[PDB]
Scaffold this active site. Sequence first.
Site, PDB file in Angstrom:
ATOM      1  N   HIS A 293       0.808  -1.221   0.000  1.00 24.53           N
ATOM      2  CA  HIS A 293       0.000   0.000   0.000  1.00 24.53           C
ATOM      3  C   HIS A 293       0.847   1.280   0.000  1.00 24.53           C
ATOM      4  O   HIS A 293       0.273   2.376   0.043  1.00 24.53           O
ATOM      5  CB  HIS A 293      -0.995  -0.001   1.172  1.00 24.53           C
ATOM      6  CG  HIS A 293      -0.379   0.212   2.525  1.00 24.53           C
ATOM      7  ND1 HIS A 293      -0.283  -0.795   3.465  1.00 24.53           N
ATOM      8  CD2 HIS A 293       0.113   1.326   3.120  1.00 24.53           C
ATOM      9  CE1 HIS A 293       0.272  -0.317   4.568  1.00 24.53           C
ATOM     10  NE2 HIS A 293       0.521   0.968   4.387  1.00 24.53           N
TER      11      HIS A 293
ATOM     12  N   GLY B 162       3.677   5.935  10.634  1.00 22.19           N
ATOM     13  CA  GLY B 162       5.023   5.840  10.112  1.00 22.19           C
ATOM     14  C   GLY B 162       5.683   4.502  10.343  1.00 22.19           C
ATOM     15  O   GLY B 162       6.748   4.245   9.769  1.00 22.19           O
TER      16      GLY B 162
ATOM     17  N   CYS C 173       4.516   1.414   9.694  1.00 26.70           N
ATOM     18  CA  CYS C 173       4.156   0.335   8.774  1.00 26.70           C
ATOM     19  C   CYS C 173       5.430  -0.022   7.992  1.00 26.70           C
ATOM     20  O   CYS C 173       6.214   0.862   7.686  1.00 26.70           O
ATOM     21  CB  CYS C 173       2.956   0.772   7.902  1.00 26.70           C
ATOM     22  SG  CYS C 173       1.515   0.805   9.033  1.00 26.70           S
TER      23      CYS C 173
HETATM   24  N1  LIG Z   1       0.268   1.070  13.510  1.00 26.85           N
HETATM   25  C1  LIG Z   1      -0.176   2.078  13.365  1.00 26.85           C
HETATM   26  C2  LIG Z   1      -0.779   3.431  13.181  1.00 26.85           C
HETATM   27  C3  LIG Z   1      -1.451   4.040  14.239  1.00 26.85           C
HETATM   28  C4  LIG Z   1      -2.006   5.300  14.071  1.00 26.85           C
HETATM   29  C5  LIG Z   1      -1.879   5.945  12.849  1.00 26.85           C
HETATM   30  C6  LIG Z   1      -1.205   5.332  11.795  1.00 26.85           C
HETATM   31  C7  LIG Z   1      -0.642   4.066  11.961  1.00 26.85           C
HETATM   32  C8  LIG Z   1       0.104   3.377  10.845  1.00 26.85           C
HETATM   33  C9  LIG Z   1      -0.609   3.505   9.520  1.00 26.85           C
HETATM   34  N2  LIG Z   1       0.211   2.952   8.418  1.00 26.85           N
HETATM   35  C10 LIG Z   1      -1.970   2.871   9.657  1.00 26.85           C
HETATM   36  O1  LIG Z   1      -2.089   1.800  10.194  1.00 26.85           O
HETATM   37  N3  LIG Z   1      -3.051   3.511   9.211  1.00 26.85           N
HETATM   38  C11 LIG Z   1      -4.390   2.929   9.348  1.00 26.85           C
HETATM   39  C12 LIG Z   1      -5.184   3.125   8.076  1.00 26.85           C
HETATM   40  C13 LIG Z   1      -4.761   2.095   7.071  1.00 26.85           C
HETATM   41  C14 LIG Z   1      -3.698   2.353   6.214  1.00 26.85           C
HETATM   42  C15 LIG Z   1      -3.303   1.382   5.302  1.00 26.85           C
HETATM   43  C16 LIG Z   1      -3.968   0.156   5.247  1.00 26.85           C
HETATM   44 CL1  LIG Z   1      -3.503  -1.076   4.123  1.00 26.85          CL
HETATM   45  C17 LIG Z   1      -5.026  -0.096   6.102  1.00 26.85           C
HETATM   46  C18 LIG Z   1      -5.418   0.875   7.004  1.00 26.85           C
HETATM   47 CL2  LIG Z   1      -6.716   0.517   8.068  1.00 26.85          CL
HETATM   48  C19 LIG Z   1      -5.121   3.663  10.427  1.00 26.85           C
HETATM   49  O2  LIG Z   1      -5.111   4.868  10.432  1.00 26.85           O
HETATM   50  N4  LIG Z   1      -5.792   2.986  11.352  1.00 26.85           N
HETATM   51  C20 LIG Z   1      -6.544   3.663  12.415  1.00 26.85           C
HETATM   52  C21 LIG Z   1      -5.684   3.850  13.637  1.00 26.85           C
HETATM   53  C22 LIG Z   1      -6.473   4.518  14.728  1.00 26.85           C
HETATM   54  O3  LIG Z   1      -6.957   5.600  14.549  1.00 26.85           O
HETATM   55  N5  LIG Z   1      -6.635   3.908  15.893  1.00 26.85           N
HETATM   56  C23 LIG Z   1      -7.390   4.498  16.995  1.00 26.85           C
HETATM   57  C24 LIG Z   1      -7.347   3.510  18.126  1.00 26.85           C
HETATM   58  C25 LIG Z   1      -8.590   3.580  18.952  1.00 26.85           C
HETATM   59  C26 LIG Z   1      -8.383   2.849  20.246  1.00 26.85           C
HETATM   60  C27 LIG Z   1      -7.121   2.809  20.839  1.00 26.85           C
HETATM   61  C28 LIG Z   1      -6.961   2.126  22.045  1.00 26.85           C
HETATM   62  N6  LIG Z   1      -8.021   1.505  22.635  1.00 26.85           N
HETATM   63  C29 LIG Z   1      -9.260   1.542  22.064  1.00 26.85           C
HETATM   64  C30 LIG Z   1      -9.457   2.213  20.861  1.00 26.85           C
HETATM   65  C31 LIG Z   1      -7.753   2.834  12.753  1.00 26.85           C
HETATM   66  C32 LIG Z   1      -8.632   2.799  11.532  1.00 26.85           C
HETATM   67  C33 LIG Z   1      -9.397   3.912  11.193  1.00 26.85           C
HETATM   68  C34 LIG Z   1     -10.207   3.891  10.062  1.00 26.85           C
HETATM   69  C35 LIG Z   1     -10.255   2.755   9.264  1.00 26.85           C
HETATM   70  F1  LIG Z   1     -11.042   2.727   8.165  1.00 26.85           F
HETATM   71  C36 LIG Z   1      -9.487   1.646   9.597  1.00 26.85           C
HETATM   72  C37 LIG Z   1      -8.681   1.669  10.728  1.00 26.85           C
END
Ligand SMILES: N#Cc1ccccc1C[C@@H](N)C(=O)N[C@H](Cc1ccc(Cl)cc1Cl)C(=O)N[C@H](CC(=O)NCCCc1ccncc1)Cc1ccc(F)cc1
Lengths: 304, 304
Positions: free
Chosen positions: A41, A143, A145
């Site tokens: 991705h 960052g 990933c």
């Molecule tokens: N590690 C990591 C990471 C963490 C934060 C930001 C960025 C990254 C890396 C980055 N690369 C990455 O993972 N980004 C994906 C989006 C994504 C990119 C690419 C691909 Cl292929 C798939 C997905 Cl899903 C990402 O933003 N996820 C979100 C992370 C998030 O907000 N959590 C909040 C946690 C809430 C919580 C916490 C504790 N207790 C209870 C609840 C959750 C999410 C939101 C919408 C969605 F529709 C799918 C998933």
Amino acid sequence: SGFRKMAFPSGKVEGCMVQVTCGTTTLNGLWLDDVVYCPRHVICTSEDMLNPNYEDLLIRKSNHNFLVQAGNVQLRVIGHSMQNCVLKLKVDTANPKTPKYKFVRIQPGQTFSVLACYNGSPSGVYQCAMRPNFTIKGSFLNGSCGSVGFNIDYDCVSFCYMHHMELPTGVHAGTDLEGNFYGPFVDRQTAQAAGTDTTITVNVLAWLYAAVINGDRWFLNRFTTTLNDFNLVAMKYNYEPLTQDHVDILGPLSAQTGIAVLDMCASLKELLQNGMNGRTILGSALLEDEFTPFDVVRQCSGVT
Amino acid sequence: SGFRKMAFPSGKVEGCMVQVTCGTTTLNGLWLDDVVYCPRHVICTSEDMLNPNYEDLLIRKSNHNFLVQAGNVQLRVIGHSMQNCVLKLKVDTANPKTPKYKFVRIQPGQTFSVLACYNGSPSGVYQCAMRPNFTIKGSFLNGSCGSVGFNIDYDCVSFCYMHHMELPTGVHAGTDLEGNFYGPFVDRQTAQAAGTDTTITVNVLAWLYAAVINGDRWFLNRFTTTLNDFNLVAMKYNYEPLTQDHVDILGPLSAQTGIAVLDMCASLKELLQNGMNGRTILGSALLEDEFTPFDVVRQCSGVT
Ligand SMILES: N#Cc1ccccc1C[C@@H](N)C(=O)N[C@H](Cc1ccc(Cl)cc1Cl)C(=O)N[C@H](CC(=O)NCCCc1ccncc1)Cc1ccc(F)cc1
Ligand SMILES: N#Cc1ccccc1C[C@@H](N)C(=O)N[C@H](Cc1ccc(Cl)cc1Cl)C(=O)N[C@H](CC(=O)NCCCc1ccncc1)Cc1ccc(F)cc1
Ligand SMILES: [Cl-]
Ligand SMILES: [Cl-]
């Protein structure tokens, strides 16, 4: 004496971490010989992420669209392919710091070390188990990933995890180094739910044996249980069924401590039914399940 | 998201680990430039260990009595001296893998990473705090003496601990890299007792802030306390007094989460008085004190 969550020394993997950039999207890659491995991705824009067709997006890419940074020096990409969810970039320089390595796909309940990286630069190392529902409870920010999980066996590095995403629940999902996700997940930005998790029973038992090796015995009792009567209690507390293979895997620990596995299972049953009543085991007030029997043998003394 | 005990990447220290042998006694040494640092009791026999006069034992040694092994190649010793409880061996080869480094002596309550080594070979890495009574609760077996603890700051390695002994209670004692023990201990094989330990209050508070940054809030309350009324409760539960300097060190975390330090202290007071009642904080059923405010900032997101 002592027992701690212990990672493998990370130096062999540190020398492999690089940075891959496609458009405004940067993540980490793994540089082994003349190939860089990273999550596919990286070729997606924030638009493409909702529902990408990667075969479509990749055929629209050329080699010079990928910027690979190993420390300061750029690596020139000379070829690119897709293997499941990992991108493979051929580069014109072999990594001189390439260790002996293999790619392995692990089973739930197995542990590995994570080298968390940002912009190709290692920031920390910690231990993880693959949960029964195929997530890991990691520590990852934007960052990260591309970071990898690994075990080390006699200077051979067995890579087993590449990090791809954090789920809405805050736990983490990824692939083996050939791009196959652990669990049912796909690499698109949609809310995906993991199955309900369970506790890794064989690992709790291993950790109780670690406690005995370290001189703590307060939780033992004179009783034994049958495997089937144990599992009836295990099921009630959302523990994984214990198999005869698990029993046999715990053979060495049982032998070193003189405590029969089904003897230890009666301790676990009593701890599940009565709690700890304010006492701790190896510094913990809950039953810990992220140490395999191998982890215990590796860290603990061969004599009790 | 997520929070784990996280060590620094250990590669820079791995390239420095060697093996030092004197008689039938082998332990680990640290090779920086053309000097190898190791615990001075390597020059002791099992006889000498009860009450050694090291100045006596060292003047009876010659350079060729020390065998230094860096992987496979022997290093030739060309000079030796004693600095407090560390032996310093000059060798005829500078370590090509020497990182940028310094030696620092830490305060109780500060954390570092331990690279556990056996026969000059790294086996694992874990996180430690220096306890208030100047011990560490490590994980060490026979052969590990000489292993070092360290922090990393922008590719500079700050070495702060060298391992010298396990006490009869199973906790661990050692020196800074200039040979000065932490705490009242001496390097002889006698039963030595550490002072009574206390809980590192500023670190518990930092870990509560980590929990809030990670979205866990169940332990908060509407109340505040004065610093002095907090310490009266702290003293009752064997917690370290909290100082105005600790309050100010927690400034950034307070600001990122909007929770005043004395507000968080009222949460800690209530948790000490009422326990957790079966709930967990960041996966733990007890209050964790081996994360400094710096550790929390380093690992957690800069946004809540
Ligand atoms: N590690 C990591 C990471 C963490 C934060 C930001 C960025 C990254 C890396 C980055 N690369 C990455 O993972 N980004 C994906 C989006 C994504 C990119 C690419 C691909 Cl292929 C798939 C997905 Cl899903 C990402 O933003 N996820 C979100 C992370 C998030 O907000 N959590 C909040 C946690 C809430 C919580 C916490 C504790 N207790 C209870 C609840 C959750 C999410 C939101 C919408 C969605 F529709 C799918 C998933
Ligand atoms: N790490 C480590 C390590 C661990 C095991 C073996 C060897 C080593 C490294 C090795 N290098 C080293 O430390 N050996 C010193 C002896 C020594 C060498 C050199 C110097 Cl300068 C000082 C001393 Cl004291 C060592 O044997 N200690 C003993 C270790 C031990 O039996 N614990 C049992 C724990 C009991 C317990 C456990 C859990 N819960 C409650 C109780 C304790 C001890 C015994 C007699 C004595 F009189 C002083 C200390
Ligand atoms: Cl297989
Ligand atoms: Cl200073």
